[PDB]
Amino acid sequence: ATILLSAAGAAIGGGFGGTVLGLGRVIDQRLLGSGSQSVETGRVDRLRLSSASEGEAVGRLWGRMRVAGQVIWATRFFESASYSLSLALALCEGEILRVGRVWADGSEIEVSGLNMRVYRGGEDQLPDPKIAAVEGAEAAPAYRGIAYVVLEDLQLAPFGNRVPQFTFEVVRAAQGALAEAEPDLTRGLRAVALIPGTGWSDGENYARGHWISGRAVAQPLASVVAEICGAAGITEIDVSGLYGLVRGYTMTGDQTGRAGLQALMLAYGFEALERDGQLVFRMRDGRVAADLAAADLALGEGEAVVETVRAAEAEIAGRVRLAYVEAEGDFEVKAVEAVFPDAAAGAAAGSELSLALTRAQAQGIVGRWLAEARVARDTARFALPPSRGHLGTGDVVRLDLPEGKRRYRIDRVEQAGLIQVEAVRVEPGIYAPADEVED
Amino acid sequence: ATILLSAAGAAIGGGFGGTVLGLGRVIDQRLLGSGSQSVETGRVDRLRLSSASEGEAVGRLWGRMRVAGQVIWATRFFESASYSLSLALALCEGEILRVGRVWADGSEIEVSGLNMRVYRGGEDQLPDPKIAAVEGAEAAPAYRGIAYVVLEDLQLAPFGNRVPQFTFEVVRAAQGALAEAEPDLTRGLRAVALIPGTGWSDGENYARGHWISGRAVAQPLASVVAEICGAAGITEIDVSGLYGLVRGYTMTGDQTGRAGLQALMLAYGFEALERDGQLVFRMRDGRVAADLAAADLALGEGEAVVETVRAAEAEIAGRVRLAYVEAEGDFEVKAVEAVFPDAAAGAAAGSELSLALTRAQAQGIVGRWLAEARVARDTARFALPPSRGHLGTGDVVRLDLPEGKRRYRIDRVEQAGLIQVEAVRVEPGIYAPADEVED
Amino acid sequence: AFHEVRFPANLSFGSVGGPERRTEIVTLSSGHEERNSPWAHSRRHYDAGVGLRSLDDVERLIAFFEARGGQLHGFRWKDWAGIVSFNEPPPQGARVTAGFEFDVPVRFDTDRIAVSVQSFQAGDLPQVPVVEVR
Amino acid sequence: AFHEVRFPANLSFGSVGGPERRTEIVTLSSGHEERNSPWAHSRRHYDAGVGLRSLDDVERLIAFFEARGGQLHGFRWKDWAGIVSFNEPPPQGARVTAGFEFDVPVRFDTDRIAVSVQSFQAGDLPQVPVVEVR
Amino acid sequence: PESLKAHLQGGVTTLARAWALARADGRVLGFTDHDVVLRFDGISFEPGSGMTAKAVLQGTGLSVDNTESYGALSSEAITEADLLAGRYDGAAVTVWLVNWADPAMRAVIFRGHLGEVSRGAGAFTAELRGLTAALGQEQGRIYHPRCAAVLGDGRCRFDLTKDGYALEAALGGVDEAVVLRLAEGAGFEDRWFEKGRLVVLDGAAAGLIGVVKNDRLQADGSRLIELWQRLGANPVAGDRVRIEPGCDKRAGTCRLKFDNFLNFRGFPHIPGEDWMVSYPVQSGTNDGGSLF
Amino acid sequence: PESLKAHLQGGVTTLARAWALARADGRVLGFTDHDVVLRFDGISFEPGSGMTAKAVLQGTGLSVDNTESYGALSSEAITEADLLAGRYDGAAVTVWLVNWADPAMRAVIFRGHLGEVSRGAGAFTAELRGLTAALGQEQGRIYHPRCAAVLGDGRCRFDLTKDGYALEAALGGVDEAVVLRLAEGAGFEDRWFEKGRLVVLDGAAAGLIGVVKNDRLQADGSRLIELWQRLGANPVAGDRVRIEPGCDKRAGTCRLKFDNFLNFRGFPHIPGEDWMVSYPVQSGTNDGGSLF
Amino acid sequence: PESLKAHLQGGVTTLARAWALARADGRVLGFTDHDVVLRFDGISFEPGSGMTAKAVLQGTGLSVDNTESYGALSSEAITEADLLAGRYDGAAVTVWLVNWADPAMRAVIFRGHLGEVSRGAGAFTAELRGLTAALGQEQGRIYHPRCAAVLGDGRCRFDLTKDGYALEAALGGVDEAVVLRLAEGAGFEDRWFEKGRLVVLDGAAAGLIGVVKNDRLQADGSRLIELWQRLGANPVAGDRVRIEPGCDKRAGTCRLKFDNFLNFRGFPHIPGEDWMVSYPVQSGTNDGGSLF
């Protein structure tokens, strides 16, 4: 007997379920290009609160960034007669540097007032804190990986009498097998000293000064993306072409692995190329590798030497926005925007990045996207012969035409013995410092 | 070499990504019909709270409706010795009428107790409030578009000592180039007076009384939909066929433009027709323009003169629901439902409209949808010749048959020189007042 | 576009060709029809030319496709079938002639041609369709 | 729609054509099935006309397609096969004649025609399918 | 159709499609199916290009209409060096359905906005987005601590010619259309205009807008200026540009460089989340001040 | 299959498909592939219609099964003036797989619910939704301040015939099947039944339910009543309708017009969100009362 | 390509595809298009199987690459009794593009991971997931009150051979490859290993891992052990298994049975949601204690 209109049903499931197996987002997709599908990424956490449940995941972070933590092993309320507790707040995993500048619900509490005992969460397996001798040694938990902070005889008097939501500035050095080789500051320094001293003051040259207070924490972008693939298990990871400072990224547990990495591909713009099995992560530039003439393209599928698509004017992202974290002061969600002067009439396209970066840098990034997303309107769809197959999937083609000589970075190489390319328009001058003043 | 089963992959992306480029929802789709895809719309805000972050968008509203506002420029807590602040809460954009009936966290505070200075947010660029001479004149912000309300020497004593969430009744007149032409009450009145006076009392004839207290605020539906396309930039907008009162609609910033408008297409039901480049917004009626006989249809694609689809009984929306705002009393989220007497056994389909309307009107709307969604089960799919091409995309066809003579409003006209139509069944008696009693 | 020559003189019996129209049509399924014409003119659309002479004629014919041809040039075409009107109806033809005296400038409807050898000196090619681009 | 002329007199042996019925049909896979037609007439649908005369007849025939033709005009058609009824059943034909005496106004079912030259004076064209639009 | 129904109800009809697009520049272009050049307005529709007219769709919903409109590119036509450089972006069309026998028998099918143009293989294919393209986009301000408007905007009117602010000087040394030497660098501050409009009003790039960055004068008032993006048309080292001054969109740069601090349209103070959930501790500074 | 395996394991088999649908009205309809009229139950399956039987699908998941079941509409059959008016909506089917040589050798493939029927070109195509159609729908009450039940419901039993409440009178003046004159208007209040069941039990619309609105008597007890929707079958100005009274589903209209205020099944007071986050101020009214 | 461009820029080229997959076991397999067995490394590529090489795709995005790689299964080859039992799961490939005239002229197209293998009709079809398969997965710990690590893990090192913990004994009585009799049951506690690794290192299932359950000794140290799942290859009642002990992943079972309570990597106390929103009532127990 014949078939019904579940011919449309078998066309979907699993007719299209096989695809995504083997495979605000308003601005996330244009920056990756045709590329691949941009996974939902980094709904930035504002009002960081600590939930004491059993279903919250272990967070991870790299550098100076506040994290909420959560309660593990709180004793009963103790009335001195006007209360007292013994908390232990677990921040993040891995060996960390020390936790300073604790502030609870509200503005600020002085850490000298507290009796906190910070712990690195060392794989060395730090023993029991002995404040858990309330429980006793025989049931004292001895957390190996996670970096918990206990609190001792905490007076609940100044903040009500309820438990306040504590939030902790944490400094975590990037770890992993690629990180222990090639040591950056956080252990590479091996004794700096030279404290300038010589005592409201002269901090106008701090952004250009030789001294390294504050910014010694920030990990290079090379090892943090190496930490992601290390935790995911890819040790074949190649990352020598990366040049960036992280300064406090933070993704939670069960953040897909790649969706934590994909926020970095919007900020620093790097390729995630994978020429060979190395998965080369190179920083994206305009350095042209191909120099094709128009005479040197192959015969494509659609029988056009170069199909050139220019995207709609009604969707060009006239103004772009961020949701970065303040990273110098009290870590709070902020926003800058870049507005193109001719067409400001609409198309607001913003996204949220959960990392922490300064004020002139955020206006630099959004100034870079608004230029790039209007440059990346043009896409090219051509086929080039396997006579020059050394055009890796992330290279950029000069592509001489009779009218233009416009560069093109390429995506979605599908070859089978005929390299067919979905390029995208990329200029070299996009990837520069914006050189803006600071706050 | 051959191709893989990414033939299913290239069938999706961007094989189907080109479509939505050039293009509770349970009841939203049936009311627009085959029509077009109903965008997610109006998750109604209950517990209106004010967040003092930097990532919340500028709200917009039209008429008497409470809005949360947010904090901009709060001074430090001042202890008289038992606290004091200097807030400024920014409500919405555009020139507004005055803000009355402020109520904070909780029930109600008397505005005579406050020292608030309301501001219209005039494009005339209102100067500094001089309460920001705390900051000084040289850094005093002088907000042009947004309508902020400062608060002066606010005692935080009655509501705890924390800052309470303030919520403000705001009256905003519909603006835009189509609104300044054809003035309605809010400036059209040009002096009414005639205060009845002649002093629990006789308000049983207020809904039928000649006096205009309260309902003088409510803007006509013609200019509010003109304000949307004006802010979106369509000045070619045609709206003379609209007849409705808005009474306090509210969409936030980044509400897509159209998704704010699409809530009105569910309430007042209007076409958004676009015969010509005017984009005619006409109110939907049953006024028949076509009078086709069965002999006068063209030869379609499927080689059937009229394909008639009747939708499933298991999905007819047996009971429909709303989430309107109270609009007379303390503005709170409410709900009414209309239940069809024969089939009440299931299919609850509700949606949420963020506008404000009275009690007999809400039961009128849900009484209209439950009738319409069961009428709009029948859809017709026929083709009519270009000999009568003056059937615009939103007209309604009599469509004489041998058995029935059932009307059909049309959608999805695709012509290319053969006008092929996906109609939908529409009766005239649906669009009437329900004539119900009030609360 | 050229004004170069008519053609080689030889044309075999069977050189077919007649005017075209788009005239898209709806065929109203329950009665008569209604149909539109956007042309006001007609592409003459000559087909099925055949060169048949010695091989001395072939090398001036294969490069007829090549030299002044390429793809995109005129080579005014001779019809064996300044404004000409047709008065045999009470309607009118009134169809213009950009070239003089039935010369109908065309172009070949081929990506390639195919000349055959039939004997020591026989040169044949089966078809060269044209459409008379303006 | 015109009333211009019948046609050139010549029609070759093989000028085929017979009534065409919508006959919308369901074809139940069980067995017997029902059907109905919305015409109450029948498009006569004549095909395969051939003009064969001298080349003097051709130029009044190629512009027959063009001048009063275009695509969308009548040119009443002569059948070699005011209301005519058919009484050989106890049912009836009762089919109308808008034109007089079997003249059946039509239109050609072609975007183009294709006239051939078969000898110094021979003019041929293989087919001109019509459908007698009302 | 508008009173051509007498023409149209007859089966004998002759309506040939035709349309005009108005570019962002003042010139229009003409296109028709009729195969003979015709005009009714002063547009002179040419059948040399354009015009396949494939299947205009409609919808009562806010979703746009569409027509891919296959055609040809040529020297008289769009020519694609014009198209690639940045023109035809917000090009407005009207499609018409004229009678070629009498062009006073016509109507508009839709007035479009021509969103996506895909050119290739010596031809172009241009999706005609419908009247409702602007709906479906996000418009709003997000209370961010910068400004929000451009210089010419109504929310911050400036009178951008009011003094020696604009740099009107003609161009030399165009190099790779990002670097621009500019013979008359001298006349202004170093790094005066960092976010400005490089409107170029002569030559190849006629009326084309780019954005400046790196306003640096190296020697004797050279004023080497970069841009974010290519202009897309090469200036010929003789063109005239004018550059409006640069706004950092910040309160300090607003009031110092420009006088217009009144028309700010920005949100400088905007306390923060941690202020909001804070309860007032009775320690340290609790007197009225800036909170900055 | 149920013990026809002895028939079925042989390659020589003869199982001809056949099914019966029971309409919402008491009559059933018969359909078979066998090409000869056969019956096993009192259904008399007719091969004159129905029966293409295309590809019943299955699933352990809650998703329904489906069968499009192409067929024919005729005067003996569905006839489509029956179908369009509102019948065959919740029509229940059983598909069978009978042996035509012996109809006692049969089973049920599924028992369906016939959701979507698409008729066209002189035929009908009717998607047979599976047994699990009711799952996948939202059922609930939302604490709204009206009532929630219909009059006949178990949550509000009424005894709807208990007095002169129902209007049993025969119909005249049907007009456009929305307006109904009704000769015997007199006997009740003006605007008595505003949300009632217009069950019409005779003639063309036999047992068809509409909902009333605008119960107005103009002169001498005319009682002109509108409806929300068309009945879909024209009443013939002689039919008998009965109209149950109208419930506004409100506490005031409940207890006044009807006695049954006990069986309310509604939520009248329901304080509100602003009450919930309110802290008690010690000013004004703070004594026990209605809060209304 | 790596310095075969001199070979490749000529139109006369001869690059024949070829690839090697390394299974989870130490053996590799060879595959080539060249139709003659060739090798460059010690792999001995065989053209007897594999190798249709359909359309490797790429992407700058984190999404994997793919190649379906149609081929043949045979006794020398994969043979599909190997594949079905649980091998070739995380099989790592490298595809090469060798010159068959000179195999020193080669490169790697990608190094894959061979995710989905669909075998059927006497052939196999194996989707080659790209290098980035591991990205796109969720990895994390959720503060649950058990442990979180396996026995061999770095977060809980154990020295799993340190005493008589492992049961090294050779197998008898395999039955349906879930029940295992085991001749040498005696030597351990009853129900000693309940979540352990049944690594079988001889015979048919060579190096195949299952998980134990129901460690019960019925008579004279029989130790009948179930498994969760089939091994997929039948052990032959003579194989040698070793079973590591079972960890309940709980603090009581941690410290009692095992000494390693220090390396816990778990979260035993974890107070709860109701503790968090609780305000301290000044009644009953409010002295410092376990809260357990």
Ligand code: SF4
């Ligand atoms: S700084 Fe002044 S002129 Fe410049 S954008 Fe801001 S408000 Fe407008």
Ligand code: SF4
């Ligand atoms: S008013 Fe009474 S009878 Fe009517 S629906 Fe409500 S509870 Fe039932």
Ligand code: SF4
């Ligand atoms: S009980 Fe001990 S050995 Fe076992 S998994 Fe837990 S920590 Fe590791």
